[PDB]
């Protein structure tokens, strides 16, 4: 209907996610709602996210609808009224949207003290967290050099160099083949995801796992930048167990927990056994 | 090998008695009876006591031409958890045992003999519909291997494909 | 000089290889040359060797080049007249033409057996050799399927995936990004080589040390098909000491022995252990 041309329009932001779209076009449909009952807001709200994540095919929309249906289950615990726990639910989401806003730039703080000086950073594709953390890091007066791989599928490399020159960074555009090629002369790893798993691995571009394999073959840290509210409550056995619908030539593989270092959220520096402690403490 | 070892040295050794050939008793047997200090084990403890064990000492029914190994069932796993706790392995063969044939012989490799030894025949009705698979050999990496010890003396598996050229000519591979 | 024009014109039949070319040219010109000692034959095919290097980037060219001269200077330690010795280097060089033509099918006939039905084959880029070895296969009535990866560099994965096709062979073409994503799905890996380095490792495809890695880390098979002439005395110890000559994004890469199961050459089937007695044994 028009659900997908106020998601779609959401995305006018560069910046924005498009997790933060669906969960504000999400919010934006809860108060618009004209429903008396918490089940039928909640079954409208759920077939919302299912064509929403129809739209867009990315994981973090998913993500970010079960993280929408679980607050709203946890707001209707408590008051049970529908009216105040209406108010209730508009208010905190409100906050959950201020909170998680500005989560990247928590997530660059807090990361940019890991990048020495001199050191040498391997990226895959473009990402807007490692590109926050490299900002944050050359605003301390630090010299580094960044090698990043073109990724084939869609060319997210180039525009990653592109953006990274304006900020007068050292960058080498590099092929998606030649990555055991310059493993050698990288001194860590950054990448970014588009969904943590309740192991701790990684949902990220199709070339990424190849490159926590060459690294961990040469004991290089590799490092996983990810917010919040990319935690969904998958456990992939292997390549084959990811659903198709994220998939779709492979658009996104996944990236098990003993292959990577450690992860960067808005929470702090965790390790991957962080994310299942937390969706066990959630609940979902 | 470890009857002569004995006579000047003491140690402890284990031995793993095959699930379908229990050929290890009678080896604990032979080694008890001339004062080793020797235990007896299933396959199953093979792992679970490997964490104690130094060294690894076995033999082979043949030698293949990259070095990997014709041994009884079982022995690979062997090999698997002696390379998870990086304990040498030592292989005990003479020369009449390297076979100038490549592991591109399968389906046929392994010697399988009667489901009696592992399924008896008196179960009853579900041996009509249970499909049982006995085999005798398995294949061994040569990647697992540290030591071949032969009359020559001790060599590498990564030098095996000489030896075969001492012994053989290449125009009587396939025979 | 107006020799690369002879190299160039001698490859007109699209399946004679760099190097077997190089010494095509090599042996005309050394009965073209009028020369009357043995040191000057050696100078002026030296001289030949590197302006034909110069043209050909591939490391096959050096290693035929080597091999040449290792051939020379064999021939020239018997007889000690250079009339002898060159008609003997003549027949002898006659004799080498026709008996390296005839390595690629010993290599196919010798290596598709280790090819079981039903089983999944990857392969980097277009290679004659591996497509021998895969169509002599085929003619032994067995079924199988071939990934074959991109090269993205310049697109051989497709001329392969062509080939395959035209032979009924069911191929798909993969991404050089997803090779970490289908290595669960193969059963043997079969690649080329442009040259074999002194320790046993090979000189590929920048595409091909990141694939040996993966394959390492799931256990699958690495199995390498390549010529006898192709024996080159290099140690390079990581990326970095392979000559920059052979390099030109980097065109060539190197993969250490022990990511490397069996190759199959015209000398037979041997371990990356033996490469370093043969060029002992020839003292190159």
Known sequence: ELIEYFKSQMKEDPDMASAVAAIRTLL??????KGETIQGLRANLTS????????????????????FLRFISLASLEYSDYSKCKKIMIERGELFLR???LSRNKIADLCHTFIKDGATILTHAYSRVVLRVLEAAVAAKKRFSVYVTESQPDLS??????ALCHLNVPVTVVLDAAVGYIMEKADLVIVGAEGVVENGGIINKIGTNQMAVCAKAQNKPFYVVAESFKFVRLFPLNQQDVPDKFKYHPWVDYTAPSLITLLFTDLGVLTPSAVSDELIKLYL | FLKEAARKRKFHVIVAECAPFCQGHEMAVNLSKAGIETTVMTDAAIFAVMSRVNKVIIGTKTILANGALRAVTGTHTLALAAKHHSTPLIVCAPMFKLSPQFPNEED????????????PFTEGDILEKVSVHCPVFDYVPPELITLFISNIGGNAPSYIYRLMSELYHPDDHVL
Do not use: Q, W, Y
Request: glycine share 8%.
């Open chain 2, 108 to 119: 046929s490799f392994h010697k399988f003999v009667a489901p009696e030894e592992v399924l």
């Open chain 1, 28 to 33: 934006e449909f809860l108060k618009r709602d």
């Open chain 1, 99 to 101: 909170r998680i806003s």
């Open chain 1, 157 to 162: 490399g180039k525009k990653m160099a592109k």
């Open chain 1, 48 to 67: 919302a996210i299912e064509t929403l994540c129809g739209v867009d095919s990315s994981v973090a929309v998913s993500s970010g609808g079960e993280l």
